[PDB]
Amino acid sequence: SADIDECESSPCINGVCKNSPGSFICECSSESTLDPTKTICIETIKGTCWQTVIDGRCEININGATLKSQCCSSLGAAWGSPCTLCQVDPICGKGYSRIKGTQCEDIDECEVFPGVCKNGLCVNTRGSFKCQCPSGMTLDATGRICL
Ligand SMILES: [Ca+2]
Ligand SMILES: [Ca+2]
């Protein structure tokens, strides 16, 4: 006989899975709390979304008040203080956050990072976003600057 390792299926939404005999356990960090089913960490505390990681620290606060799942599944390199490195949802991937089951929902990057478009209008799209330039202007290579 062997125990099933349920953690292989990434059952713990926004949490860490710990296998156990006959079951599994989801653990939440201090910015979240378990739902009734004990498989989803519901975000309770916002924190800083960092655009970069350098040496042993995180830099460039792009928004001081983001949901970790929103930050980390889109434009953030890291989140919080002290910070931890962002990983996209293993099921939904970049641009989306996992809500329940394998259900993914679009992240609005224009809300995660107000000002992501340096001199244009941020326009959210499903799975990404784009910068809309003033009339007569076009985007640079990075897509964030209008010229
Ligand atoms: Ca198990
Ligand atoms: Ca989006």
CA of 73 to the centre of ligand 1 (A): 27
Residues 98 and 51 grouped into a single domain: yes
CA of 3 to the centre of ligand 2 (A): 39
d(CA 58, CA 124) in angstroms, rounded, equals 26
- Report which DSSP code applies to 28: -
Residues in the chain: 147
CB-proximal residues (5 Å) to ion ligand 2: 106, 124, 129
Pairing of strands 41-43, 47-54: unpaired
Residues 33 and 50 grouped into a single domain: no
d(CA 128, CA 116) in angstroms, rounded, equals 12
Structural tokens at position 113: 């990072």
Neighbours of 142 (CB within 10 A): 8
Residues 16 and 36 grouped into a single domain: yes
Residue 60 sits at φ, ψ, to 5 deg, of 70, 85
Residues 115 and 145 grouped into a single domain: yes
List Cβ neighbours of 48 (8 Å cut-off, separation of 6 or more). Answer: 58, 61, 63, 64, 65, 66, 79, 80, 81, 83
| Total tally of structural domains belonging to the chain | 3
Rounded to 5°, angle at Cα 68 from 64 and 70:
95
Exposed, middle or buried, 51 (CB in 10 Å: 0-12/13-18/19+)?
Answer: middle
Residue 133 is part of a domain; what is its CATH number? 2.10.25.10
d(CA 121, CA 145) in angstroms, rounded, equals 10
Residues 30 and 66 grouped into a single domain: no
Element (H, E) at 17: strand 16-20
* Cα 57 to the center of its chain, rounded Å: 19
Domain hosting residue 130, numbered range: 106-147
Whose tokens are 């089951």? That residue is 101
- Say what the resolution is, in angstroms: 1.8
Structural tokens at position 105: 């929902």
Residue 114, classed as helix, strand or coil, is coil
d(CA 34, CA 62) in angstroms, rounded, equals 28
CA of 72 to the centre of ligand 2 (A): 13
Method: X-ray
d(CA 103, CA 87) in angstroms, rounded, equals 18
Residues 36 and 75 grouped into a single domain: no
d(CA 27, CA 41) in angstroms, rounded, equals 8
Torsion sign across C-alpha atoms 67, 68, 72, 73: negative
Whose tokens are 């897509």? That residue is 143
DSSP lists the bridge partners of residue 122 as: 131
Starting from the CA of residue 127, give the closest ligand. Answer: 2
Starting from the CA of residue 106, give the closest ligand. Answer: 2
